[PDB]
Amino acid sequence: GTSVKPIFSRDMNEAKRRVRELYRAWYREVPNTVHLFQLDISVKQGRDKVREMFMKNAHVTDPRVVDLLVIKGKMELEETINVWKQRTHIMRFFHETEAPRPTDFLSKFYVGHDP
Amino acid sequence: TYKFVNMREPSMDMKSVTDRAAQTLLWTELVRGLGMTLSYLFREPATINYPFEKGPLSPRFRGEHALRRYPSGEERCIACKLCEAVCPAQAITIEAEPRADGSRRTTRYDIDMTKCIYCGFCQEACPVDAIVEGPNFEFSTETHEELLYNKEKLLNNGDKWEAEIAANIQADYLYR
Amino acid sequence: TQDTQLIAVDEKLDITTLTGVPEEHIKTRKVRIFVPARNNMQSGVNNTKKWKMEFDTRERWENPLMGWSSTADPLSNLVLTFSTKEDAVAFAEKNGWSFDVEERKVPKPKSKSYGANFSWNKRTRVSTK
Amino acid sequence: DTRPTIRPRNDVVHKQLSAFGQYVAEILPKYVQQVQVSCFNELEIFIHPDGVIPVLTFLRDHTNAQFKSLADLTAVDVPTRQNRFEIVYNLLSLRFNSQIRVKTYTDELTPIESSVTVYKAANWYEREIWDMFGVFFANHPDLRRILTGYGFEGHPFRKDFPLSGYVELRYDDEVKRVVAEPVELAQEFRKFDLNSPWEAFPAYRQPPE
Amino acid sequence: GSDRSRFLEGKRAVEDKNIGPLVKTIMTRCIQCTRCIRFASEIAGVDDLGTTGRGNDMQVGTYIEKMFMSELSGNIIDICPVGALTSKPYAFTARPWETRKTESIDVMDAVGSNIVVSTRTGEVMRILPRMHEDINEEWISDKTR
Amino acid sequence: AGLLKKTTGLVGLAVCETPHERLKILYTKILDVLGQIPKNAAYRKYTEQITNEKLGMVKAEPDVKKLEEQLQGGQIEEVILQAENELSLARKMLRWKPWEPLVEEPPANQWKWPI
Amino acid sequence: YIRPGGVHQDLPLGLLDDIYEFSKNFSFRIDELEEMLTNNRIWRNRTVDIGVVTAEDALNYGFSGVMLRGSGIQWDLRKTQPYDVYDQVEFDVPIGSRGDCYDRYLCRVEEMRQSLRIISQCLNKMPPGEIKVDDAKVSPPKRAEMKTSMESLIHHFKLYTEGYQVPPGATYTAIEAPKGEFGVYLVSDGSSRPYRCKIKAPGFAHLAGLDKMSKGHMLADVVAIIGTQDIVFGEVDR
Amino acid sequence: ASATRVIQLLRNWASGRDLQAKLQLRYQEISKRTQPPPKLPVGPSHKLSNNYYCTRDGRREAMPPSIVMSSQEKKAVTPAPPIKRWELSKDQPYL
Amino acid sequence: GVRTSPTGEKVTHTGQAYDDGDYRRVRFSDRQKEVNENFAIDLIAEQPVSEVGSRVISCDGGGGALGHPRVYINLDKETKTGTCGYCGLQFRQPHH
Numbered sequence A: 001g002t003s004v005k006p007i008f009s010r011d012m013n014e015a016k017r018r019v020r021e022l023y024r025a026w027y028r029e030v031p032n033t034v035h036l037f038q039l040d041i042s043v044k045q046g047r048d049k050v051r052e053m054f055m056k057n058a059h060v061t062d063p064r065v066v067d068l069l070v071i072k073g074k075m076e077l078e079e080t081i082n083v084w085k086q087r088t089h090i091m092r093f094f095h096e097t098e099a100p101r102p103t104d105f106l107s108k109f110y111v112g113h114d115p
Numbered sequence B: 001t002y003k004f005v006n007m008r009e010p011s012m013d014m015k016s017v018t019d020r021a022a023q024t025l026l027w028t029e030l031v032r033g034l035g036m037t038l039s040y041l042f043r044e045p046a047t048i049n050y051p052f053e054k055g056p057l058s059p060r061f062r063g064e065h066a067l068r069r070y071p072s073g074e075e076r077c078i079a080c081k082l083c084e085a086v087c088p089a090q091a092i093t094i095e096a097e098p099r100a101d102g103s104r105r106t107t108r109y110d111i112d113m114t115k116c117i118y119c120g121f122c123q124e125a126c127p128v129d130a131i132v133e134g135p136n137f138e139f140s141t142e143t144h145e146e147l148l149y150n151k152e153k154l155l156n157n158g159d160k161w162e163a164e165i166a167a168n169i170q171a172d173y174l175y176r
Numbered sequence C: 001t002q003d004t005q006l007i008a009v010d011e012k013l014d015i016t017t018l019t020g021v022p023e024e025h026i027k028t029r030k031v032r033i034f035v036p037a038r039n040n041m042q043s044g045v046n047n048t049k050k051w052k053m054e055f056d057t058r059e060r061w062e063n064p065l066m067g068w069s070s071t072a073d074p075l076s077n078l079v080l081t082f083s084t085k086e087d088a089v090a091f092a093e094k095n096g097w098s099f100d101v102e103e104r105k106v107p108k109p110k111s112k113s114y115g116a117n118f119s120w121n122k123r124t125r126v127s128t129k
Numbered sequence D: 001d002t003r004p005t006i007r008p009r010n011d012v013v014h015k016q017l018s019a020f021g022q023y024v025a026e027i028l029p030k031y032v033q034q035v036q037v038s039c040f041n042e043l044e045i046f047i048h049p050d051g052v053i054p055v056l057t058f059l060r061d062h063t064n065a066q067f068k069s070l071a072d073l074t075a076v077d078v079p080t081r082q083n084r085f086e087i088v089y090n091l092l093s094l095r096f097n098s099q100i101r102v103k104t105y106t107d108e109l110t111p112i113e114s115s116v117t118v119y120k121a122a123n124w125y126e127r128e129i130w131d132m133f134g135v136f137f138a139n140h141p142d143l144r145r146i147l148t149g150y151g152f153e154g155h156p157f158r159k160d161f162p163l164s165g166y167v168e169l170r171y172d173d174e175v176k177r178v179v180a181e182p183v184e185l186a187q188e189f190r191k192f193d194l195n196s197p198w199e200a201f202p203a204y205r206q207p208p209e
Numbered sequence E: 001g002s003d004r005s006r007f008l009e010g011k012r013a014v015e016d017k018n019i020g021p022l023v024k025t026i027m028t029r030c031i032q033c034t035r036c037i038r039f040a041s042e043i044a045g046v047d048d049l050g051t052t053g054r055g056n057d058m059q060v061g062t063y064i065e066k067m068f069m070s071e072l073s074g075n076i077i078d079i080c081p082v083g084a085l086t087s088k089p090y091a092f093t094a095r096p097w098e099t100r101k102t103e104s105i106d107v108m109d110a111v112g113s114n115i116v117v118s119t120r121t122g123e124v125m126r127i128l129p130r131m132h133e134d135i136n137e138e139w140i141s142d143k144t145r
Numbered sequence F: 001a002g003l004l005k006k007t008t009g010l011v012g013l014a015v016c017e018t019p020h021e022r023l024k025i026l027y028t029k030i031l032d033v034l035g036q037i038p039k040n041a042a043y044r045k046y047t048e049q050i051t052n053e054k055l056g057m058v059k060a061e062p063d064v065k066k067l068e069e070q071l072q073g074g075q076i077e078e079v080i081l082q083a084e085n086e087l088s089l090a091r092k093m094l095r096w097k098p099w100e101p102l103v104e105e106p107p108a109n110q111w112k113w114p115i
Numbered sequence G: 001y002i003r004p005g006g007v008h009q010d011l012p013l014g015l016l017d018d019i020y021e022f023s024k025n026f027s028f029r030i031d032e033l034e035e036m037l038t039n040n041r042i043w044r045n046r047t048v049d050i051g052v053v054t055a056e057d058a059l060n061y062g063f064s065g066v067m068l069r070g071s072g073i074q075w076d077l078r079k080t081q082p083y084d085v086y087d088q089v090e091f092d093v094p095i096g097s098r099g100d101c102y103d104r105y106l107c108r109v110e111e112m113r114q115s116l117r118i119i120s121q122c123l124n125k126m127p128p129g130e131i132k133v134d135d136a137k138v139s140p141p142k143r144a145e146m147k148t149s150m151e152s153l154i155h156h157f158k159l160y161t162e163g164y165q166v167p168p169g170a171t172y173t174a175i176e177a178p179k180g181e182f183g184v185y186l187v188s189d190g191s192s193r194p195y196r197c198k199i200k201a202p203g204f205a206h207l208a209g210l211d212k213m214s215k216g217h218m219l220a221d222v223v224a225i226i227g228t229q230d231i232v233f234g235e236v237d238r
Numbered sequence H: 001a002s003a004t005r006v007i008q009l010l011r012n013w014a015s016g017r018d019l020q021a022k023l024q025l026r027y028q029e030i031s032k033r034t035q036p037p038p039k040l041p042v043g044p045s046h047k048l049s050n051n052y053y054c055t056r057d058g059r060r061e062a063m064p065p066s067i068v069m070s071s072q073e074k075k076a077v078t079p080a081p082p083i084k085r086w087e088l089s090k091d092q093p094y095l
Numbered sequence I: 001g002v003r004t005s006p007t008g009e010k011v012t013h014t015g016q017a018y019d020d021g022d023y024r025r026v027r028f029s030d031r032q033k034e035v036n037e038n039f040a041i042d043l044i045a046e047q048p049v050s051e052v053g054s055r056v057i058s059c060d061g062g063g064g065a066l067g068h069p070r071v072y073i074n075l076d077k078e079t080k081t082g083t084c085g086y087c088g089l090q091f092r093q094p095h096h
């Protein structure tokens, strides 16, 4: 029924807690990768990208779900500070080559039959 | 049953000890290797010089495809799509149409030689022996587009290697 | 049943946060939950006993080099069989897809009688067998 | 045997394993939910998820079982079943030259205790299952992607995942680095509806629901 | 059915009869219909299809050269278990496994028959009648097909 | 006993110079740890029915080689290992409490194949 | 070539004789390899008592094949659970004692010669008969009956378009592949296509044990440990 | 391309064996690449009578997995009798 | 057979020919448009019709197993010569 087995967190609050030290670690992590990975973006240009994912992932309310991606974020952070990823992998977050996609209905109508 | 492989305890007799001591001091198994290679130096090299002479094959070899045609000249492919239905790489792409004569041939027979893996299922598939890989293992091209064969190239390969396919299939049509 | 700190979660399941479906393919795409129709040129009915969920069709343009059927919607050739309808739809909300449900069309029960082929007055006498 | 095509049947092995099926069921009635032996003499031990650690230790340590080799650790994602994923273990008993299969069920969210302690082989199999399917395994030494590319999102072996995927790759010169783009096939995968509309096996006919 | 044939004689061949520019008739394939015959005499009313003779041949067709046209004539194609009565406009355009079937409603008439639009590679080769009982049973007009 | 076995074949396991005594004290430990489990438990009956016989043969048969055939468990070194493993399992089985009715029935159609 | 229900087609005439000619020559080269390395001191030091794995940990690590036979565990699927006609063929399974890198090298080389005995028996005891199951609903009929018989053509059509529909069920069959215990877990819904195919790769379990082996050994040893493990990355990456 | 006898001894002596008895390079001993047409046999079921599929099929004779207990004194039993320890080789004992 | 398009292209057996504008035509320039001359359509017409006298005639296509599945063409309609659907060889009764 409603009773489900929680992963680590026991309600929203410490689920809200775990997203913090992920942000705590990510924020401390940005400037050294920009140096180590020889990135083209600025130190400022990394914090927003770290930031914008977080409230992009904001409609989520289930405590089990919240703890599930905080592990994925931790793993992504894990596979970043050992330079396991590469310049291309990190840059894939910046949708650079992909041209901007329209948003208004009229532009959708002009390009092709798609919602 | 099983056989033990390496636990052979060496003897400690003075003859055996001096033999091992001579082996370690006066390197022998190292010389045994040198004498081995020298013996294997005066052999006849297994190499064959390229295209002037070529390696040996079998009549059922699988290579560049070809779309043969009947002794009359009419193409064998009646476009049953069996080869497309069995293609493991989905390289076969064919569409048929009622031809002007009324016969049942295919408008398009693009075989993508960059997808299919030469399973040979296609030659096993069509009940009219229409598609078949030729013995020509050599069709390397300089551009990617050249490998994407259409129906026209397939028929040209059929008209070029027809002597081999008739002979090779004649040899192996009894084994299958 | 487990004594493993059973929290009573109530919010409806939504794993769209994790499946990784890109933003375009999660909201805009509409899935249809239906029982496949019996292929009319056949007569067997084995293919109409499992609910199937399929996605809407998108653009199919011909490749310039050689006439192909190139598309750019990954969720095109993806059907999923489901035993019962409520179990099929439970997948849709869980993956947050705007679903459309049909109903299980089944052949209505007919009454067949070989004696009707030769009636005395009823106009159902078959002209030839 | 007059029949030259039908595979021979080994009833002695069938009876032998079935008796062991009653054995394991009686020893651990707390986790074992169902036990069956297939026609080709394979025993499936249907356990409850919390029994992953206790049951496995029994077959690995009990004198009369002695299953001391983790053959494989897989899951078959069934979108139909309420808890879709179904984690499957295969164990081989060197002393009794027999194979057993303990199968358990799990949804996307509920985690399964990692069998690394009872079977240290499971450790790398543990990582693959999460990577391909998304079944998170509790208290694991190091859960991480093992197969997919670094930063790859989604769980590929999951049925809802498309065959071709969502992300392609190519070299783009204005950035002088490999970049990811939305998938755009030069040829869509021609799906084939190669299912006979006639029942194939009266023996396995489902009840008339 | 078996997996091999013990027939050791010569098979019979039957001449084809033309009964439409929309239905093909390779009559040498079909086997003692009573399906084409009943459909013409019960659902379409056109009493032109029939059987001629007895024995192994007993040719099934129209005897005299007639032209089977009715508003529901095309439905003999999808009630043919054997590939004799085949859609002439189709004429080996594609084959079943490769085509994708989508369900829609015909708009040619106002009855609104449920149809299956079998499409592949971005084109429509065949229009099949779906099943809806009260709407269209399992028949569609040749206009819709 | 003769000359002690130079090796057991398997790397790792060392030749036990006190085979019978190790079997006796280990098998007595089995009957102890079992004794701390309710009698109605099926784990008790089968394990004691297995170990007590094994304890019976080791006491009766003093020759090592005849003992190996007596328990058909290869050499003694892997027998002491199994007797050790049964000890750990029995020690760990008492806390697991695997004799109550099952934790709960699985969902309705969790099994059954095909779907 | 090896298909369900039997091989695709019979061997060409004179193939077995060509096998006999090669098998005569081969044992005169296997020893030639042993002359080059087996007693060479440099090869010995590079391979003796290096990358040593014990018995229980190797068994627990999911190892198979040489990893078991090299460390003393006398296990071989060809003998314990013989598939096909492996029971009717006499052969020995080399078992090592030290379990290190070197002992496996002899185990593999001795497996060469033991295979030669198997080949000698297979050539000498080849039975007459067909090459595929007579069941045409499972194996495609020959081209001869294809073009004359109704049932053969119908079966060939459906077999190469739909394929044989296997009964529902799941099984895990493992064989003593040269690397190790290669096994597949096939789950079938009952249609003409598999529902799930997990592929137990012998190198998958092996390679997880790389860290346990290479403990205190230098990098050059790690190169040696990779070689003895006999890993090819098609099987492990699946 | 047969070696001169002078070096035939050299290769034989330097490796301590007779190479010329069996060489890696193939020669005329190979089977001819052109063979007579073969006649393949028929299977056991190629009988024109008493070959009914109902008494010959293999697929339709598989039952569903037999169920022995569902959650819906007895002697201890091992899954199979313990293996018998392999005997030592006879053709080649300890290497 | 192979004709010439108004642009200069060679029409194939299917009748495919890139038209005047047809930007795709750039590929053939500095190259050739591969066309097979042995057109199957007119390579079967000149084959004579067999004057065999019977009512049902088999057609193996030549070579037995080398041919096509044996089909029985009905040579009864005395207006049009029966043709095998696999190879196109026309068979006809010898006009009684």
Ligand code: SF4
Binding pocket: B083, B086, B087, B088, B089, B090, B091, B092, B111, B115, B116, B117, B118, B119, B120, B121, B122, B123
């Ligand atoms: S050879 Fe095999 S893979 Fe290649 S096109 Fe033919 S059937 Fe397909």
Ligand code: SF4
Binding pocket: B076, B077, B078, B079, B080, B081, B082, B083, B084, B094, B122, B125, B126, B127, B128, B129, B130, B131
């Ligand atoms: S090549 Fe063969 S399989 Fe393919 S359509 Fe032609 S006859 Fe059929």
Ligand code: SF4
Binding pocket: E029, E030, E031, E032, E033, E034, E035, E036, E060, E079, E080, E081, E082, E083, E084, E085
């Ligand atoms: S076309 Fe179909 S319905 Fe008509 S006679 Fe032939 S098999 Fe029977």
Ligand SMILES: [K+]
Binding pocket: C041, E076, E077, E078, E079, E080, E081, E082, E083, E084, E085, E086
């Ligand atoms: K039909």
Ligand SMILES: [Zn+2]
Binding pocket: I059, I060, I061, I068, I084, I085, I086, I087, I088, I089
């Ligand atoms: Zn013909």
